């Protein structure tokens, strides 16, 4: 059983910044990739970024490359998404998910409840 809790969402104007956090409880995040996704009303749940295990790198979606940065703090069992140079199109609920597959296939069994980001 894993419980994920996102926070750090809110309202910002274009060009602004936010930092999201995703705190995990009940298993270590150290052994698994952690991903960020986002969903705006009417749209598919879109991949944003993944932080794999330490030394296995971070990867990003085209839409956020060079503006968002994913990072991990294994000791705090928490991952972060630094979001810079925000634009209206970034408005969405942001979700974190743990990849249950050690091989990084993205078996996303556990999802957070989401935190709302609005850029206006």
């Amino acid at each position: 059983x894993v419980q994920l809790x996102x926070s750090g969402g809110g309202x910002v104007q274009x060009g602004x910044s936010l930092x999201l956090s995703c705190x995990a409880x009940x298993x270590x995040x150290x052994x698994x990739x952690x991903x960020w996704x986002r969903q705006x009303p009417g749209x598919x749940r879109e991949x944003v970024x993944x932080x794999x295990x330490x030394x296995x790198x971070x990867x990003x979606x085209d839409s956020x490359x060079g503006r968002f940065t994913x990072s991990x703090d294994x000791x705090x069992x928490x991952x972060x998404l630094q979001x810079x140079x925000l634009x209206x199109x970034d408005x969405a609920x942001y979700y974190c998910x743990x990849x249950x597959x050690x091989x990084x296939x993205x078996x996303x069994x556990x999802w957070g409840x989401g935190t709302x980001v609005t850029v206006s």
Partner: protein, 219 residues
């Protein structure tokens, strides 16, 4: 006997066009004592009249102001049907859409015949068909069922023994899982004595994905 049969996809991408069709049996789309209506229903806004088409020596339309700039309701006399076209949809258009016959006569102005409804979800996500797993009866009355997991969009329907089993069936409303996909279960209680001799098969249908699956549920 007058019947209305609805058809059309229940998934529409944002900014694209919703298109549904209502085929009439037992009456004429040109009847001068009826009007052919579309009404939608959502949890947030209730029942909302959308518009109508009707023939009185000439074809007429009335539309709700809020959708008039996007809506078209046209008859097809050759096929004896009428259509709904709603352009540039947004999530505010997610709803169950019904067609209905409005009797318009001396003693009555009412919606007396309704289509079965089409659940329309405005989303750019792709369809996903469900997986069906058994809820096996445990080792008097016994409970068994089927778990219908990970589908999109709504709805799925479930029957038991191709409709022959109805007593004691409970099919739960779908739940939106944290992944954004839906699941539901359907259960039935039966005599525990009946387990080794009677067969129980759940029939699962997910029309958006053209999925049909039977699952025998055994101890």
């Amino acid at each position: 006997q007058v019947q209305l049969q609805q058809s059309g996809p229940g998934l529409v991408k944002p900014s694209q066009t919703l298109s549904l069709t209502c085929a009439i049996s037992g009456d004429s789309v040109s009847s001068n004592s009826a009007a052919w209506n579309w009404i939608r229903q959502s949890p947030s806004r209730g029942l909302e009249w959308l518009g109508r088409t009707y023939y009185r020596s000439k074809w007429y339309n009335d539309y709700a102001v809020s959708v008039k700039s996007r809506i078209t309701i046209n008859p097809d006399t050759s096929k004896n049907q009428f259509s709904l076209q709603l352009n540039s949809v947004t999530p505010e258009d997610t709803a169950v859409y019904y067609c209905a016959r409005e009797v318009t006569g001396d003693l009555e102005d009412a919606f007396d015949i309704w289509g079965q409804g089409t659940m329309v979800t405005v989303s750019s996500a792709s369809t996903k068909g469900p997986s069906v797993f058994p809820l096996a009866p445990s080792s008097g009355t016994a409970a068994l069922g089927c778990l219908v997991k990970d589908y999109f969009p709504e709805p799925v329907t479930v029957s038991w023994n191709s409709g022959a089993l109805t007593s004691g069936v409970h099919t739960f409303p779908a739940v939106l899982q944290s992944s954004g996909l839906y699941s539901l279960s359907s259960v039935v209680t039966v005599p525990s004595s009946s387990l080794g001799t009677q067969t129980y098969i759940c029939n699962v249908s997910h029309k958006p994905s053209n999925t049909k699956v039977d699952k025998k549920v055994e101890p």
